[PDB]
Amino acid sequence: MLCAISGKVPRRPVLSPKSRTIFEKSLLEQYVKDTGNDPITNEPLSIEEIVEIAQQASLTESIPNLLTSLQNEWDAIMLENFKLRSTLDSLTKKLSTVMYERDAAKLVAAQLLMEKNEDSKDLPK
Amino acid sequence: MLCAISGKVPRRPVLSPKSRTIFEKSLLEQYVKDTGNDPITNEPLSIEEIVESAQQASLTESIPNLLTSLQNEWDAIMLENFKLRSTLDSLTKKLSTVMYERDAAKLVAAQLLMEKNEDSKDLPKS
Amino acid sequence: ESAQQASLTESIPNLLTSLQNEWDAIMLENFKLRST
Amino acid sequence: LTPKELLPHDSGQEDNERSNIKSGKQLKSRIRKFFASLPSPKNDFEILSEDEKEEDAEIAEYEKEEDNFIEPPSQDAPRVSLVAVPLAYSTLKNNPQSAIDNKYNLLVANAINKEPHMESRMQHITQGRTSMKIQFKTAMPPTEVLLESIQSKVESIEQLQRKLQHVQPLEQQNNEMC
Amino acid sequence: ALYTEYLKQRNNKKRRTPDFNDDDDTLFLEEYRRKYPRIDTSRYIPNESSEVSLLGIV
């Protein structure tokens, strides 16, 4: 029901043979023209590999309002795209702060075991 | 703009109705008088089959080309989301393993600060 | 069973200014054509 | 025993081996992939782990080099860090499910803080004012370099479009007279 | 009706209108301006790569 590139209900769906995934003909072709690969599994796939695989028409309501409806949806999609990008840069940033403290803690463990090794020599004497 | 047989600019274009392709009239007529065929697909084609109203037209410029333009705007923006969604499943998968090895190591740091202080507490009393 | 249209250098306008002029020119012409 | 251009190849291989030990044991996060110096934030975060947060803040200020750099007597680490990584790995289906459930809770917490926002408003418009400075000056340069070239050929295009509207108007009155 | 009245339906020019130090709905407006500038620079970058050549062939 959903193309796993844009999430639209596909109007001319194509399936990849290297990985089980029904894509859209337009979006998969733009990816293959960039790099000859499958977007999910990164396997070598070509345009001739694709096998070209429910349609229900929207009936919105009972025309100048439909202009401002389109204006609002492109306005919302631009913000629903922007908010998902700043979330990606900050979760990678907060992952970076965890990577420094992971490597700093395993250096603090080196001096703490030395204090335990110095203590084990003193307990034996 | 070009003739598919020769490669020149045709001065009298005729389009065939078996394989749609803009051929020059004097070139394709000799091709048909040779054998009754269409040079691209080798299907049968006669001279009367080759062909050179009221609604006035205007040049293709930036309604229809505007609607196909906004398809290109959004189908490219849809690929921009995939660059984000695939990078999010890599950083969060690495964050799950980093926070797990942080949660598994901090229990050892809590025990080493116990053991190295208990061994200092044991040795100094003796 | 290719055409090239050079998009303008000042291509907001495709949402606002270009799209209103297309549905103005569709509306005024056909009404003038019914008057014709 | 007669070496010739071998001690130079051996000194280059010993120097290539020493650079491989210094590059690997410099820092784990700095060498892999990708901050401002702030001693006031390290003083404010003292009141957390409350011992390890100050150990990691001093490690971040040392690797980055209102900023003073003190101790690069920290990172000969390469044999002690290998024993520390192997000892911690021994202390660490069920663990894979507990990491996936905690990742979904952190993803729901990341989606809730973003939804509440959409102080902080003044920084986004200033980043836009930096963008409106950078992109529109880049736009006005790309437009005027285009308009010096395109508006000449727009007039080549639009005046030839005007020839079509007169060739069509002469065609209809001739077809009417035909 | 629009041609008989001769009046056109108004488009949204709010993105030109936005101003600093304003409320949460206008914070959505300024971030909309950032996404439009990144798209406008991307659209200008394609035209520069194409060159006049693309205007020449049409």
Swiss-Prot record, chain B:
Subcellular location, record wording: Nucleus
Domain U-box, first and last residues per copy: 1-62
Protein origin, superkingdom: Eukaryota
Membrane-spanning intervals of the chain: none
Residue ranges of the region described as Interaction with CEF1: 63-120
Region (Required for self-association): 54-126
Disulfide bonds: none
Note: Present with 11700 molecules/cell in log phase SD medium. The tetramer is an elongated particle consisting of four globular WD40 domains held together by a central stalk.
Family the UniProt entry places it in: Belongs to the WD repeat PRP19 family.
Described function: Probable ubiquitin-protein ligase involved in pre-mRNA splicing. Acts as a central component of the NTC complex (or PRP19-associated complex) that associates to the spliceosome to mediate conformational rearrangement or to stabilize the structure of the spliceosome after U4 snRNA dissociation, which leads to spliceosome maturation. It is also probably involved in DNA repair.
Oligomeric and partner information: Homotetramer. Component of the NTC complex (or PRP19-associated complex), composed of at least CEF1, CLF1, ISY1, NTC20, SNT309, SYF1, SYF2, and PRP19.
Name of this chain's protein: Pre-mRNA-processing factor 19
From Swiss-Prot, chain D:
Start-end of Basic and acidic residues biased regions: 6-20
Annotated region (Disordered), positions in chain: 5-24
Compartments it resides in: Cytoplasm; Nucleus
Residue numbers spanned by region Interaction with PRP19 and self-interaction: 109-127
Role according to the record: Involved in pre-mRNA splicing and cell cycle control. Required for the binding of the NTC complex (or PRP19-associated complex) components to the spliceosome to mediate conformational rearrangement or to stabilize the structure of the spliceosome after U4 snRNA dissociation, which leads to spliceosome maturation. Its absence leads to an arrest of the cell cycle, possibly due to the inefficient splicing of TUB1.
Family of this protein: Belongs to the CEF1 family.
Subunit note: Belongs to the NTC complex (or PRP19-associated complex), composed of at least CEF1, CLF1, ISY1, NTC20, SNT309, SYF1, SYF2, and PRP19.
Miscellaneous remark of the record: Present with 784 molecules/cell in log phase SD medium.
Entry protein name: Pre-mRNA-splicing factor CEF1
Species annotation: Saccharomyces cerevisiae (strain ATCC 204508 / S288c) (Baker's yeast)
Organism placement in taxonomy: Eukaryota, Fungi, Dikarya, Ascomycota, Saccharomycotina
Gene encoding the protein: CEF1
Shown stretch of the complete protein: 332 to 541 of 590
UniProtKB/Swiss-Prot annotation, chain E:
Subcellular location: Nucleus
Function: Involved in pre-mRNA splicing by stabilizing the NTC (or PRP19-associated complex). As a component of the NTC complex, associates to the spliceosome to mediate conformational rearrangement or to stabilize the structure of the spliceosome after U4 snRNA dissociation, which leads to spliceosome maturation.
Subunit annotation: Belongs to the NTC complex (or PRP19-associated complex), composed of at least CEF1, CLF1, ISY1, NTC20, SNT309, SYF1, SYF2, and PRP19.
Note: Present with 721 molecules/cell in log phase SD medium.
Full protein name: Pre-mRNA-splicing factor SNT309
UniProt organism field: Saccharomyces cerevisiae (strain ATCC 204508 / S288c) (Baker's yeast)
Full-protein positions shown: 60 to 117 of 175
